[PDB]
Amino acid sequence: ILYGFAIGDSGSERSKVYSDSAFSLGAYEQSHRSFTFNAPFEGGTMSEAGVMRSAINELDHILPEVTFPTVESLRDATYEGFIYVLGNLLRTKRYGAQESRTGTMKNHLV
RNA sequence: ACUGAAACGAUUGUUGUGCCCCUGGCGGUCGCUUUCAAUGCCU
């Protein structure tokens, strides 16, 4: 009911939680760094049976102080609907790819 | 029904493996513990 559903003829409901795409306060050149990764054989080596694995690449990451100013907006909610959604804003803490390994963010309500 | 309603490019992954700040090197060379002295005075 708060974030919505669409089955088809069997029902749909519009999201009451409105939101926008958030932007870094500073520039990309100031707000990222690129980190190499590799994946060797368990025997500790990029070589197995005398042949090299192709498993190396760079990946791009946002930095540990970058701020994303955000307005999230909730239409026509009950009091408990506001506590559920405000709950999600304070209770969830990981975003983006590779959340098993990265991507913690602190949602400071202002 | 805003070309509409809901909408994670995601999952997993070690910049890794080996490596002697190494080799050679006289704290060395010269240098007087020196210079002067009554076992003395009387029996």
Coordinates of N, CA, C and O in Angstrom, one line a residue, chain A residues 15-70:
Chain A
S15 N 2.4 4.1 -5.6 CA 3.4 4.4 -4.6 C 3.0 5.7 -3.9 O 2.9 6.8 -4.6
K16 N 2.8 5.7 -2.6 CA 2.6 6.9 -1.7 C 3.9 7.5 -1.3 O 4.0 8.7 -1.1
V17 N 5.0 6.7 -1.2 CA 6.4 7.2 -1.1 C 6.9 7.7 -2.4 O 7.3 7.0 -3.3
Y18 N 6.8 9.0 -2.6 CA 7.5 9.8 -3.7 C 9.0 10.0 -3.3 O 9.3 10.1 -2.1
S19 N 9.8 10.1 -4.3 CA 11.3 10.2 -4.2 C 11.9 10.8 -5.4 O 11.3 10.8 -6.5
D20 N 13.1 11.3 -5.4 CA 13.9 11.8 -6.5 C 15.3 11.2 -6.6 O 15.8 10.7 -5.6
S21 N 15.9 11.2 -7.8 CA 17.3 10.8 -7.9 C 18.2 11.8 -7.2 O 18.0 13.0 -7.3
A22 N 19.1 11.3 -6.4 CA 20.0 12.1 -5.5 C 21.3 12.4 -6.2 O 21.8 11.5 -6.9
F23 N 22.0 13.5 -5.9 CA 23.2 13.9 -6.6 C 24.3 14.2 -5.6 O 24.0 14.7 -4.5
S24 N 25.6 13.9 -5.9 CA 26.7 14.3 -5.0 C 26.8 15.8 -4.9 O 26.7 16.5 -5.9
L25 N 27.1 16.3 -3.7 CA 27.3 17.7 -3.5 C 28.5 18.3 -4.2 O 28.4 19.4 -4.8
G26 N 29.6 17.5 -4.3 CA 30.8 17.8 -5.1 C 30.8 17.1 -6.4 O 29.9 16.4 -6.8
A27 N 31.9 17.4 -7.2 CA 32.2 16.8 -8.5 C 32.7 15.3 -8.4 O 33.3 14.9 -7.4
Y28 N 32.4 14.6 -9.5 CA 32.9 13.2 -9.7 C 34.4 13.1 -9.5 O 34.8 12.2 -8.8
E29 N 35.2 14.0 -10.0 CA 36.6 14.0 -9.9 C 37.1 14.0 -8.4 O 38.2 13.6 -8.1
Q30 N 36.3 14.6 -7.6 CA 36.5 14.8 -6.1 C 35.9 13.6 -5.3 O 36.2 13.5 -4.1
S31 N 35.0 12.8 -5.9 CA 34.1 12.0 -5.2 C 34.2 10.5 -5.4 O 33.3 9.7 -5.0
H32 N 35.2 10.1 -6.2 CA 35.4 8.7 -6.6 C 36.9 8.3 -6.5 O 37.7 9.1 -6.5
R33 N 37.1 7.0 -6.5 CA 38.5 6.4 -6.7 C 38.3 5.0 -7.4 O 37.3 4.3 -7.1
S34 N 39.2 4.6 -8.2 CA 39.2 3.3 -8.9 C 40.1 2.3 -8.2 O 41.3 2.5 -8.1
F35 N 39.5 1.1 -7.9 CA 40.2 0.1 -7.2 C 40.3 -1.2 -8.0 O 39.3 -1.7 -8.5
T36 N 41.5 -1.7 -8.2 CA 41.8 -3.0 -8.8 C 41.2 -4.2 -8.0 O 41.2 -4.1 -6.8
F37 N 40.7 -5.2 -8.6 CA 40.4 -6.5 -8.0 C 41.0 -7.7 -8.8 O 41.1 -7.6 -10.0
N38 N 41.4 -8.7 -8.2 CA 41.8 -10.0 -8.8 C 41.2 -11.2 -8.1 O 40.6 -11.1 -7.0
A39 N 41.2 -12.3 -8.8 CA 40.7 -13.6 -8.2 C 41.6 -14.8 -8.6 O 41.4 -15.4 -9.6
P40 N 42.6 -15.1 -7.8 CA 43.5 -16.2 -8.0 C 42.9 -17.5 -7.7 O 41.8 -17.7 -7.2
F41 N 43.7 -18.6 -8.1 CA 43.5 -19.9 -7.6 C 43.6 -20.0 -6.0 O 44.3 -19.2 -5.5
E42 N 42.9 -20.9 -5.4 CA 43.0 -21.0 -3.9 C 44.4 -21.2 -3.4 O 44.8 -20.7 -2.3
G43 N 45.2 -21.9 -4.2 CA 46.7 -22.0 -3.9 C 47.5 -20.8 -4.0 O 48.7 -20.8 -4.1
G44 N 46.8 -19.6 -4.0 CA 47.4 -18.3 -3.9 C 48.0 -17.6 -5.1 O 48.7 -16.6 -5.0
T45 N 47.8 -18.2 -6.3 CA 48.5 -17.8 -7.5 C 47.5 -17.5 -8.6 O 46.6 -18.2 -8.9
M46 N 47.9 -16.4 -9.4 CA 47.2 -16.1 -10.6 C 47.4 -17.1 -11.7 O 46.7 -17.1 -12.7
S47 N 48.4 -18.0 -11.6 CA 48.6 -19.2 -12.5 C 48.1 -20.5 -11.9 O 48.3 -20.7 -10.7
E48 N 47.4 -21.3 -12.7 CA 47.1 -22.7 -12.3 C 47.6 -23.6 -13.5 O 47.4 -23.3 -14.6
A49 N 48.2 -24.8 -13.2 CA 48.7 -25.7 -14.2 C 49.6 -25.0 -15.2 O 49.6 -25.4 -16.4
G50 N 50.3 -24.0 -14.8 CA 51.2 -23.2 -15.7 C 50.5 -22.2 -16.6 O 51.1 -21.6 -17.4
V51 N 49.2 -21.9 -16.4 CA 48.4 -20.9 -17.2 C 47.7 -19.9 -16.4 O 47.2 -20.2 -15.3
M52 N 47.8 -18.6 -16.8 CA 47.2 -17.4 -16.1 C 45.7 -17.3 -16.2 O 45.1 -17.5 -17.3
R53 N 45.0 -17.0 -15.1 CA 43.6 -16.6 -15.1 C 43.5 -15.1 -15.7 O 44.3 -14.3 -15.4
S54 N 42.4 -14.9 -16.4 CA 42.1 -13.6 -16.9 C 41.3 -12.7 -15.9 O 40.9 -11.6 -16.2
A55 N 41.1 -13.2 -14.7 CA 40.3 -12.6 -13.6 C 41.0 -11.5 -12.9 O 41.3 -11.6 -11.7
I56 N 41.3 -10.4 -13.6 CA 41.7 -9.1 -13.0 C 40.8 -8.0 -13.7 O 40.5 -8.1 -14.9
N57 N 40.4 -7.0 -13.0 CA 39.9 -5.7 -13.5 C 39.9 -4.6 -12.5 O 40.0 -4.8 -11.3
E58 N 39.7 -3.4 -13.0 CA 39.4 -2.2 -12.2 C 37.9 -2.2 -11.9 O 37.1 -2.6 -12.7
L59 N 37.5 -1.6 -10.7 CA 36.1 -1.1 -10.5 C 36.1 0.2 -9.8 O 37.0 0.6 -9.0
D60 N 35.0 1.0 -10.0 CA 34.8 2.4 -9.7 C 34.0 2.5 -8.4 O 32.9 1.8 -8.3
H61 N 34.4 3.2 -7.4 CA 33.8 3.4 -6.1 C 33.7 4.8 -5.7 O 34.6 5.6 -5.9
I62 N 32.6 5.1 -5.0 CA 32.3 6.4 -4.4 C 33.1 6.5 -3.1 O 33.4 5.5 -2.5
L63 N 33.6 7.7 -2.7 CA 34.4 7.8 -1.5 C 33.7 7.9 -0.1 O 32.6 8.5 -0.1
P64 N 34.2 7.4 1.0 CA 33.8 7.5 2.4 C 33.5 8.9 3.1 O 33.6 9.0 4.3
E65 N 33.1 9.9 2.3 CA 32.6 11.1 2.9 C 31.6 11.9 2.0 O 31.2 13.0 2.2
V66 N 31.2 11.3 0.8 CA 30.4 11.9 -0.2 C 29.0 12.0 0.2 O 28.4 11.0 0.6
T67 N 28.4 13.2 0.2 CA 27.0 13.4 0.6 C 26.1 13.6 -0.6 O 26.4 14.2 -1.5
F68 N 24.9 12.9 -0.4 CA 23.8 12.9 -1.4 C 22.6 13.5 -0.7 O 21.8 12.8 0.0
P69 N 22.4 14.9 -0.8 CA 21.2 15.5 -0.3 C 19.9 14.9 -0.9 O 19.9 14.7 -2.1
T70 N 18.9 14.6 -0.1 CA 17.7 13.9 -0.5 C 16.5 14.5 0.1 O 16.5 14.8 1.3

